[PDB]
Amino acid sequence: GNEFSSSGLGRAYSGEGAIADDAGNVSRNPALITMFDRPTFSAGAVYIDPDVNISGTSPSGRSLKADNIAPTAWVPNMHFVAPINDQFGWGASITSNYGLATEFNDTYAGGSVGGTTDLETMNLNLSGAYRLNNAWSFGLGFNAVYARAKIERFAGDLGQLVAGQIMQSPAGQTQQGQALAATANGIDSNTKTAHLNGNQWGFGWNAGILYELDKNNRYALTYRSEVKIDFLTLNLPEMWEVSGYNRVDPQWAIHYSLAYTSWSDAYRIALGTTYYYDDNWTFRTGIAFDDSPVPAQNRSISIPDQDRFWLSAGTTYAFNKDASVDVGVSYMHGQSVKINEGPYQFESEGKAWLFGTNFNYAF
């Protein structure tokens, strides 16, 4: 599930890669290109409104509350698919496969692990798909990712711990130590202690292997590579996804995906259903989960990621066999978990609401 389409949001991004009803999906499964007759164009974006709230106490008395540390964000998509002839087709899309941003105040007791953390990514993908049989089709594409990162950490209340520490050791009474005692408590809870900002482009491929028992049933195996971004170096994780779509009735369908990302450790489970009311109206709903990459001990307050549920419901309105708009609503709720970072002990619990719109035009 990755903000690449309003349609997607609507079905908890379940099945994508095995469902082609809008240029949207080639982005996720090259091979789907071969499922479009005319050349299709889809555009739009999604608006995420998180609600990450940190709570807890420092071993320095200073509080560790950080209400609403996650900022809203807009995520746009550009989707173009067009058939070259009868066995070859190409397509391109501008999408944001990944994006993270949490932000604390200058004076956070624990700003040693929580200044500001913005990391924006943009994906430029150009690709072609091949068809070799009413059933088998293979797609392959190339990606250029633009990564913008900002990292800020402050002294929080370290000096206050370094202090109270020295004011416990035999070097305590000592006034030759008193300096060390304070002078640490002296350090201002906002003294920038980490500033590394920069931009750079990453590259990588991704392939598809759609197979379809017929006009109403298909399964795919997609693969998204690894992307090394050299600033320090950043790594976007490999993503092996398996999905299936079935049109059980003239008016009903079923789509499911089981994704597996390997951050040099996690998977995503989704299932949703579509319902084609008539020529004009369509309605979709999707449920989904996705175990968290982070292993118990190494969690982080700066990276609000943990086992979470997706609950989605969306609707598409086709103007006239050529144009259509989709509306996407998804509500993400990740249960609460305590983090044990640096010398502090926090508790994280944040939800989020997604709203997205896309327009669909075919030639």
From Swiss-Prot:
GO terms for biological process: long-chain fatty acid transport. It is found in: Cell outer membrane. One of its GO terms (cellular component) is cell outer membrane. Induction: By long-chain fatty acids. Expression of fadL is under the control of the FadR repressor. It comes from the Bacteria. It holds the Pfam family Toluene_X. It is a multi-pass membrane protein. The keyword Transport applies. One of its GO terms (molecular function) is ligand-gated channel activity. Transmembrane segments: none annotated. Belongs to the OmpP1/FadL family. NCBIfam families: PRK10716.1 (NF007988). PANTHER family: LONG-CHAIN FATTY ACID TRANSPORT PROTEIN (PTHR35093:SF3), OUTER MEMBRANE PROTEIN NMB0088-RELATED (PTHR35093). Involved in translocation of long-chain fatty acids across the outer membrane. It is a receptor for the bacteriophage T2. FadL may form a specific channel. Has been isolated from outer membrane preparation as a homodimer. This is Long-chain fatty acid transport protein. It comes from Escherichia coli (strain K12).
